[PDB]
Amino acid sequence: SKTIGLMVPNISNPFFNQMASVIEEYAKNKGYTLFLCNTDDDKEKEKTYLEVLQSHRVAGIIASRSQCEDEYANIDIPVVAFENHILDNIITISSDNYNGGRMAFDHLYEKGCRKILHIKGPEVFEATELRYKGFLDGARAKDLEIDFIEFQHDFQVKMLEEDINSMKDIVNYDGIFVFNDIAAATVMRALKKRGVSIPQEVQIIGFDNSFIGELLYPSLTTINQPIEALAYTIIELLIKIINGEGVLIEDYIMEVKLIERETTIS
């Protein structure tokens, strides 16, 4: 087989469809095509696709935001993981989510925010947990108390029909850090429906630098994940495993950077 299976939480999140496009490019450079498999952050869908990919004898699997552990132990096909650690013998590639969360706090604080909310991601996403921890560590360094709201899912179309309890109070914050750009878009939509002015009344920073942050208005200040470097790295390492080349099985963490746009003041 010259096909690699890429498991995607959902390509409805712009970040994952862009990642899938760029991984496909790097795979093509190495002579591979891709099958994309939608796992929807569901352990049983992931298990099913692992079985289906194995039965189809793909050359390798890229496992994004995995919720398994067990299931991977016997599979005899090369695997690399994006974000979530699976087993100690599978390489995990990620952005520097801890430091990105610190950068997000430092940016809001530098822009004068003192009443701060972090809309954090589901606990099962190692990446969002690290963003939360970096943000909180930043607040602790400034002796600032922060409020949290924890979403239980990444973006789903149903989110557009869901309310936040006490949405009327959100405008009272100086700044809000939202765990990713697509979730930030939903938060800004809710604020706009209530007539809230951004950034005049509240400042917003997201995470990813996915296309949704530039597509909408005002454009979203965010933390860049380096999709090209992530995709390059994932494919380079998977091909080493496929080829039986030596590589230390350890974390590969790519640098992030602040992208200042119109939802924070300057």
Ligand X SMILES: OC[C@@]1(O)OC[C@@H](O)[C@@H]1O
202 touching Na ion, by CB under 5 A: yes
In angstroms, the Cα distances linking 134 to 7, 73, 98, 137 are: 27, 32, 5, 5
Residue partners of 218: CB distance under 8 A and separation at least 6: 198, 199, 261, 262, 263
Q: Report residue 61 as tokens.
A: 């699997």
Query: Distance between CA atoms of 99 and 255, rounded to whole angstroms?
Result: 9
Question: Per CB under 6 A, does 105 bind ligand X?
Answer: no
Cα separation of 54 and 42, whole Å?
18
* CB-based contacts of 1, cutoff 8 Å, min separation 6: 56, 57, 58, 59
- Total residues at the site for its own copies (CB under 8 A)? 37
User: In this chain, which of 147, 201, 228, 251 binds Na ion, going by CB under 5 A?
Assistant: 201
Query: Which among 71, 74, 76 is positioned nearest to 43, based on CA atoms?
Result: 71
Q: Which does 201 bind (CB under 5 to 8 A by kind): ligand X, its own copies, Na ion, none?
A: Na ion
Separation of CA 190 from chain center:
21
End-to-end CA distance of the chain: 52
Judged by beta carbon, residue 29 or residue 197, the one nearer Na ion is 197
Which residues does 217 contact at the CB level (< 8 Å), separation at least 6?
262
Instruction: Report, in Å, the least distance between residue 1 CB and its own copies.
Output: 7
Q: Using the rule CB under 6 A, is 15 a contact of ligand X? A: yes
165: Cβ contacts below 8 Å, ≥ 6 apart: none
Which region, judged by CB under 8 A, interacts with its own copies, from 16-24, 72-80, 91-99, 232-240? Answer: 16-24
Contact between 125 and ligand X per CB under 6 A: yes
Question: Which of 77-85, 201-209, 230-238, 250-258 is the region at the interface with Na ion (rule: CB under 5 A)?
Answer: 201-209
Question: Least Å distance between CB 118 and its own copies?
Answer: 21
| Partner whose footprint covers residue 54, from Na ion, its own copies, ligand X, none (CB < 5 to 8 Å by kind) | none
Residue 18 is a binding residue for ligand X (CB under 6 A): no
Work out whether 192 is an interface residue with its own copies (CB under 8 A): yes
Please classify residue 145 by burial: count the beta carbons closer than 10 Å to its beta carbon, then call 0-12 exposed, 13-18 middle and 19+ buried: exposed
Report residue 35 as tokens. Answer: 């099958």
Closest CB to ligand X among residues 121, 134: 121
Residue from 4, 7, 8, 13 touching ligand X (CB under 6 A): that is 13
Site residues (vs Na ion, CB under 5 A): 201-202
Site residues (vs ligand X, CB under 6 A): 13, 15, 65, 83, 121, 125, 127-128, 154, 179-180, 207-208
Site residues (vs its own copies, CB under 8 A): 1, 3, 8, 10-12, 14, 17-18, 20-21, 24, 33-38, 40, 48-49, 52, 55-56, 157, 160, 185-186, 189, 192-193, 211-212, 214-217
